[PDB]
Amino acid sequence: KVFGRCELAAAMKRHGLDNYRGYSLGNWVCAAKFESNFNTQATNRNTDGSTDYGILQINSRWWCNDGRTPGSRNLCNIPCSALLSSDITASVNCAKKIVSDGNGMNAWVAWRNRCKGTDVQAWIRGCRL
């Protein structure tokens, strides 16, 4: 599913991400924008053999099981395919574990390089929330 901007903002807020670990809703929408362009079916293969899945491009080395990342863990206790669903619950609940791991939203390199320190509120401006 390709979410609209405000549509994704509303779904993220419903699932608890607004100010989660202190990160305002706009940070999460900005991160989803540059990780997946709001596409739940986004995937990206990495040189280490792991794959990034879904609207927040969550990585199989630590967070989900895809059966093809040797040595990896599954800390969110989900198949990576669950991160591709039109329903973002699994992605959001796993993202919460990720952002709680110690480095905050720096776990998303796209957030660090393209969202951090910017006017991220702009990503939810105009939205009925």
Among the listed residues 7, 35, 87, 119, the single catalytic one is: 35
Minimum Å gap between C-beta 72 and K ion is: 5
Tokens of 23: 């990160």
| Pairwise CA distance, residues 43 & 54, whole Å | 6
| Pairwise CA distance, residues 91 & 54, whole Å | 7
Among the listed residues 7, 52, 66, 119, the single catalytic one is: 52
Note if 7 is an active site residue.
Answer: no
Hunting for tokens 């951090």 — which residue is that? 116
Minimum Å gap between C-beta 41 and K ion is: 20
**Which CB sits closer to K ion, 10 or 75?**
75
With CB atoms as reference, the residue minimizing the distance to K ion is 104
| Pairwise CA distance, residues 79 & 101, whole Å | 20
Tokens of 105: 């939203």
**Which CB sits closer to K ion, 79 or 104?**
104
Which candidate, 126, 124, 108, 110, places its Cα nearest to that of 19? Answer: 124
Binding site as annotated, residues for substrate: 101
**Which CB sits closer to K ion, 45 or 125?**
45
Note if 35 is an active site residue.
Answer: yes
Contact 23, 121 (CB under 8 A): no
- Which stretches of the chain bind K ion, using CB under 5 A? 67, 69, 72, 104
Q: Known catalytic residues?
A: 35, 52
